[PDB]
Amino acid sequence: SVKSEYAEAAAVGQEAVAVFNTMKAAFQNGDKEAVAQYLARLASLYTRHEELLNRILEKARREGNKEAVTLMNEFTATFQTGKSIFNAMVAAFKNGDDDSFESYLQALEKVTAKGETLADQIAKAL
Numbered sequence: 490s491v492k493s494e495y496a497e498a499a500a501v502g503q504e505a506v507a508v509f510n511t512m513k514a515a516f517q518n519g520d521k522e523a524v525a526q527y528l529a530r531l532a533s534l535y536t537r538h539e540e541l542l543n544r545i546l547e548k549a550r551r552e553g554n555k556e557a558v559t560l561m562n563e564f565t566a567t568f569q570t571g572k573s574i575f576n577a578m579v580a581a582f583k584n585g586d587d588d589s590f591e592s593y594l595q596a597l598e599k600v601t602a603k604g605e606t607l608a609d610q611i612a613k614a615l
């Protein structure tokens with residue numbers, strides 16, 4: 490069901506949460522070889538989450554679940570803000586700009602610790 494597909498997408502999101510926090514620790518410790526691998530892992534995880542979210546949105550639209558569509562449209566937009574910041578963080582790493590990496594990292598935590606409520610609402614709407 491769309492609801493179980495969202496829980497699957499939810500767990501995939503939690504996987505990025507865990508990998509991000511161990512990446513943050515590695516960055517602080519200066520373990521750039523670890524950071525690089527974690528950033529690659531995160532890119533895969535964020536791509537996967539987005540693909541699952543698109544499928545769920547398309548399914549809610551086919552189902553005519555107007556409230557779920559509204560929430561998912563808002564959530565997908567928020568996801569994209571996160572992704573743009575993530576990609577900027579990756580570029581900061583390639584460039585060796587630790588000051589921008591720190592900024593982008595802290596912005597991305599704010600984007601995710603703000604969209605949490607909406608993510609929980611969607612579970613209850615589908």
Ligand SMILES: CCCc1ccc(S(N)(=O)=O)cc1
Nearest residue numbers: 568571572575601604605608
């Ligand atoms: C690239 C990060 C995109 C992103 C992932 C997860 C959430 S949350 N805490 O489920 O609202 C928001 C943005």
